[PDB]
A paper describes a structure:
Glutamine synthetases (GS) are central enzymes essential for the nitrogen metabolism across all domains of life. Accordingly, GS present across all domains of life plays a central role in cellular N assimilation under low N availability. GlnA1 is not covalently modified in response to N availability and thus represents an Iα-type-GS. It has been proposed, that GlnA1 is directly activated under N starvation by the high intracellular concentrations of the metabolite 2-OG.
Residue numbers in the entry:
A (entry chain D), B (entry chain O), C (entry chain C), D (entry chain Y): 2 to 447
Amino acid sequence: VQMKKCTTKEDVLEAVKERDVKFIRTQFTDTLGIIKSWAIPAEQLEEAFENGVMFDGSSIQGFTRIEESDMKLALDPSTFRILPWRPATGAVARILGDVYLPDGNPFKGDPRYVLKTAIKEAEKMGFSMNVGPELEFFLFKLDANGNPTTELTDQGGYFDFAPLDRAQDVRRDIDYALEHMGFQIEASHHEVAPSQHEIDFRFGDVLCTADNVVTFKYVVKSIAYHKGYYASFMPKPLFGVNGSGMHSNQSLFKDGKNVFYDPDTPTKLSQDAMYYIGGLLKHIREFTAVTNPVVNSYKRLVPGYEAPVYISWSAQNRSSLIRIPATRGNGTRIELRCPDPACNPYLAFALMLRAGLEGIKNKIDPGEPTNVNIFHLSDKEREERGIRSLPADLKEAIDEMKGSKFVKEALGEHVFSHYLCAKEMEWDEYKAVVHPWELSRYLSML
Amino acid sequence: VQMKKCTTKEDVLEAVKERDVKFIRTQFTDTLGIIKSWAIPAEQLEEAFENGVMFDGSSIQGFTRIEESDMKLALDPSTFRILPWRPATGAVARILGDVYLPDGNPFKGDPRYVLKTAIKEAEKMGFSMNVGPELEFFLFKLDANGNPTTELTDQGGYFDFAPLDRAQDVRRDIDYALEHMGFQIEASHHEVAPSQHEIDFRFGDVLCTADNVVTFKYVVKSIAYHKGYYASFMPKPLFGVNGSGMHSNQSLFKDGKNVFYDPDTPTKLSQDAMYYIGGLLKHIREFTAVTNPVVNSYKRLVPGYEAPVYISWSAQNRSSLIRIPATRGNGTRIELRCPDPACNPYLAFALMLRAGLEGIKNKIDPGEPTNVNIFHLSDKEREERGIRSLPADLKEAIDEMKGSKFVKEALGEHVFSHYLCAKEMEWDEYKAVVHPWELSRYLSML
Amino acid sequence: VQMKKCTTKEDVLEAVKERDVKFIRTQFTDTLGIIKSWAIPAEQLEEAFENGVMFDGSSIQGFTRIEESDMKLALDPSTFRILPWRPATGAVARILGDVYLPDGNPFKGDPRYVLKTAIKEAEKMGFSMNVGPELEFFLFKLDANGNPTTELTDQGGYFDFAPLDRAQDVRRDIDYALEHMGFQIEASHHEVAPSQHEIDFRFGDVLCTADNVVTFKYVVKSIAYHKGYYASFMPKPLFGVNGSGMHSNQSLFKDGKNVFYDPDTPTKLSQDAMYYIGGLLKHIREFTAVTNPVVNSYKRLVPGYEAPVYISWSAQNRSSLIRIPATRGNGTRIELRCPDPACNPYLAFALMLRAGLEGIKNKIDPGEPTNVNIFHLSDKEREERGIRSLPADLKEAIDEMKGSKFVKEALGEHVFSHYLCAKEMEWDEYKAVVHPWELSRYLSML
Amino acid sequence: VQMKKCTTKEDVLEAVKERDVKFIRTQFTDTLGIIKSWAIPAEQLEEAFENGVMFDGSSIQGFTRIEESDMKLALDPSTFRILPWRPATGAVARILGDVYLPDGNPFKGDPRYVLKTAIKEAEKMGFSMNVGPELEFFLFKLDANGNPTTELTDQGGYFDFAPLDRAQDVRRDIDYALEHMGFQIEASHHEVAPSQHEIDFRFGDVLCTADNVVTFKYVVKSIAYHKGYYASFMPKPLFGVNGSGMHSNQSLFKDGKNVFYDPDTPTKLSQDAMYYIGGLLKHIREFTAVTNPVVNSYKRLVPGYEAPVYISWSAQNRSSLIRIPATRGNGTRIELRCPDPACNPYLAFALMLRAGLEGIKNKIDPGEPTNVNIFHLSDKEREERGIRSLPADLKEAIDEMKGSKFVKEALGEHVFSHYLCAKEMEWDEYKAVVHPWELSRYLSML
Ligand SMILES: O=C(O)CCC(=O)C(=O)O
Ligand SMILES: O=C(O)CCC(=O)C(=O)O
Ligand SMILES: O=C(O)CCC(=O)C(=O)O
Ligand SMILES: O=C(O)CCC(=O)C(=O)O
């Protein structure tokens, strides 16, 4: 909206000049998926495009150590975007960058570098990945200090209207801001859980899509904050209601044609689509710790009637792990329903790409589709069907990822080790906490 | 104290007559270790000694189903005891009983029956078990309604005096009450954690010891309640301070001689003592779910510098799972340090007895003792020494117990299945709870 | 009072029988001077007198490690005393003990053992030390929960009467209790600071005197607690008013004669008295960390007009480190004014004894006495007189103690190392704290 | 911005006339680094440029005595700057000045005079100093009366975005104001600690740089105040989070060439750079009391994992005292990381310049660089490498500065004596305070 997407640094400089841009937010994503930002003046942008932007990486989790901590951000001109919630006079813009070592080599601990490596691996087989993510978030009230709470903003449900849904203005302003940041909005609605909302944007290439995921998260948070609300991408902030997931629709392309499409097959799906699904189902347990990164992710991913915890695929069944929407042609896609919006999109999308590529290369059969309600099935029926489960908690997923040579190869040694160390520290802190539930259950019994 | 221990029902009736006993609390222990009590008049005691006391078992957890729920309690006269905190005029007494089916057979789901079966198994090899348990409990404040809290009664530490320890009167009254119930007090002190106390009573035969454990728990709770306090036997009611365990000292006897003693050996320990330790260490993972029954038990049993989570044995080392106090002769005993006071003493003591008997029968070598501080060791050093760990949470211990044929054989099918079902329901409820820790950690990040 | 002091275990057993003693508090002092107590029944006292009382030493600070943590307390019958604030029916008594290793050897980390070693060293030269300590304490209010505060109980001053001093009843009950515990009270009064009081008891042999110091501290604390007050032995609980010290009057005896007395000298002081003063003045900097153990001790020991921070000796001058009261004959004594009631009396008295013995053995001249008000002197005047200062804070005293071979020899390796480690941890925690004084001084200015 | 930097008094008068400037804030820096300001009308500015501005120096700390207290401020036209937060109509401008005695001689107690003396000393050897300081500050809430607090404005961390960082508007307005006051902003971001922010401006000549440091501090404070916040340059306002330092990047120049650069050397550093580092490392202990002036500075400078307390140098290691950024050519610089923003920039920069000049003149070898994480090293490993430590507290640094003839020569007798006297009074007041930490630690124990 009102600003054509720049491709080169010259277009970025012209846009900075003509849109009265004064501050440039040089941005990158850390290992755990948190956006890292610092502001440089627009006068320094020409020097930043040539020499990079130097920063200390020892204060960034998963990055370099304190002994060798100097790092450089190489700005990507195509990611240049003006923030619409910032003032228009002396405008503020963001540029995403790639993290580099001072010797000119890319930082292998950069998640964007991991996604680029997965993209290069796909291109070596002639494949290009398109990802359409569906992010759910909660809008909660802020307290008197403007700090986040879990207080509900409405008691609405799925597709609710009227004053049952009380965030039409917030979703409207989010949609406007996203269109200003180059998003193509498709739909926006109230989700199943109270105060839960989904805003769908158009799919794109996987690198641009992961950039869009981190951008979408911080844009939604900023717009919610300026209206007096808090936007939460916690997987399960509230008990008893629906959690927030990130349904990941993915499609493969080769020579301009959708790889997953085959008009000759009765199901209109190619053998390569089945191989991609088989690789995803084979490897999903090994990087559930990445697609579902936090302890709360497994408060969302509990067996029940909501969470895609059962490893399976189907066409229309929404109780299966993998869903294949009936769209055919260039729109043929595979939806992974396990991940939540707390995951690092670069690492998660890279790992799904690598799992699908491994399935295609090794010709992994996905098995028979599960067309029944797996939630209504019992453990005996699921055991007879061979329907396995995702890791039940963060420790189990850490253990699954630790022994995975596939995840270690796909992520690189730095990302693998630092991610596992951070998750291990998080679980070790969590596992010692005496929760109020235990006091309510045991104190007056024991 | 003041009442000689009755052995026959005639002695019980004489004591009821001469001590003005009006109410008899017929008591038993349920599957999870909770004392179950109801009061009959002393006039009905003569009929209750011949026909038993009939009760409904469908309202007792782990007991019979609602279709066949009539149950009979067969009173054991040796357990007759007058409660000292109850009024002396129209005195109140308790009798423990064995649960029987209406057809005259013992209820196989009775934990006391399980312990008696373990005792019979030991006697078939000529062994008799003596157990000395060391129970820790917390003394918390009561609220305005007299309900339990976790509010500290003092900030004292181990062996603290003065007003640093603020429960000398409560411990004094508990000691008096326990001596009235036939306990032989050995020591009483403030424990390591704030508001934590240990009262040690003399060892005895394992059946009387388990009776003493349940009696001690409810006596401490009653005495604390009448002084305006709450006695908590929760394994870990507070974070950051010491949890409460139940160190289980056990000794075996045959022909009047301590089996674990051997004056000829350099370490003054018989080969049967080593076999008992080997069986305990081999099987302890399979009934950690019994010795540590609740979710909070594994908030106590965390790797660190306090909890005996590492499967090992030693003589003086208190970082080992099994300790051998230097007492020899008839006082030679083996101390298991994993269990907490929330466990069912009948099932726990029966399982330790059966594990030790399996070790003696199969000549299981316990391996080399670990004389170093295992807490100061790293995971690499513990892996090099082969030092295994106890189950990290209740789910892992449930899984370990489920596949154990030893635990299933020792407990019987009814106790095994009902205990596992109750623990599974407990963990399934716990695992879905969104804790305030997750809100504090993730809400303003995600 | 009413109970003649027992000397043998038979006398103790007779006193237990005839005074209805039911609970025995087996007591000892840890490395930092804190009384450690646990209660055994009086029925176990005969066995405890023969085999000792076993306890875990790993939970006691400065004691053994967790790998070899079994310890035995050898009860001292002469220390047997009935606590008067405890009920008379089912009376409670205390017995102090010596800590022994299980192999029958004394524990070298026991402070009582350190004092006994100092006594043996003095006896090898024919000397016996008598110590008269003068303890000051504060009387503060209890809060609603009965926890310590610093709220003043009165605004009185030195030797104040009327309702200016509001603790005549507390001092009266303390005096009664102390007389019941074998103390010979000499005087009791309100001290200089508000809510500050001094109760003087008769001197005695140094081992009995240190026993009396720890006994006095916990007796005063208990009596204050039962009247709704808190007795604080903090060196400096309040700023701007007088701190609490422990003036240590010491006298040496040989062949029944006071060593420090000489009727032929003009000052009526023997050369051995001057040698003792010289040794004390030479070594006092090396164990100031023992006589003044905590950080708050040096908030008392600040240069000013109250604290004896200047290393000097004199006869009547109370601004000197060492004061010689004009009493002569058998009452000739040397008063060390630096220590506070927070010190371990066993270690402190042992170190003063060893410093004086080193002065006598090495013939150390104490120099000229300082008969002027050293507080009114300037730093230049004190520098010309050669008047050195005590360590300014706990860190400086720790550093002085570290390099002292005299203190290491006098305390033994275990006590030296563990005491220094505890003090180092205490100072390392203290030195990082951002105090509210810094916020008041710097926040609005920097 | 919008006002070209004046060089002569004629340019200042023209700017005053054309910008409607009515009030001139004649400003100077006192001995401890606090800006001292008073307002004269712009009509008096022509007379002030000729005769100076008379003021009373007895009310300024570190300045003249009350007997001879008349002082004159000689205005520096190059420092003329219009304050942007003051009204534009009847504009308010500042002029920095040099403090002079009435006899026309410069006041030797003026810190700006000390820096000018250091500059003259450097120019006598042909050197010119360029300093780039990196200042960290905290943004705290104001109370109801607009007084400073320590209440956090956000819980963000290093390089945080979104509403995690809640001070983008404050940083934006600070950047605008600094650009108005002649600063060239380079970067601005949220720092590691919560509510902590860093704004980087371009380096310059050392005199202009120290002027910029004091200007930056009061500009940040004014802008924060007008938005309802408090800007704190306190070294360690909060415990457990990162403190605020002032990393001092310095470069030397001779004949237009960076002295520290040498293309022939393998490390691209001249021998003079090593000499400068050696002089800095040799003398840093002697003026740590200047670079770290307050008691709180050593609550920041504690051994740990954050503070540069270990005397060492390296290239990329951020655990070293001295860092050498990889920039070469004219950008070669040496970063001293010990100082905090509470220091007097004139005295601090003068002392770093003099230490480096002494290193160059005396050919002081800096030793081997320390390329390992010194924070992860133990005291034994640091002692084997000869890695010394900075003074642990303000008293130790005062004692180090007392015996330094280098600091006395570099600062002059007046500044040296008055600075030491002020620091001595500060420490003497601090050392007597009974802190609440001591009450929490000792009151219930002693
Ligand atoms: O309801 C929404 O999703 C926001 C868009 C909209 O329809 C509106 O502006 O009300
Ligand atoms: O302190 C205790 O353990 C209770 C027994 C006792 O010594 C007392 O009565 O005070
Ligand atoms: O005032 C005192 O020290 C207590 C003793 C006394 O004189 C009294 O009982 O009032
Ligand atoms: O965030 C900042 O450092 C302030 C500058 C900026 O980017 C803005 O105006 O938002």
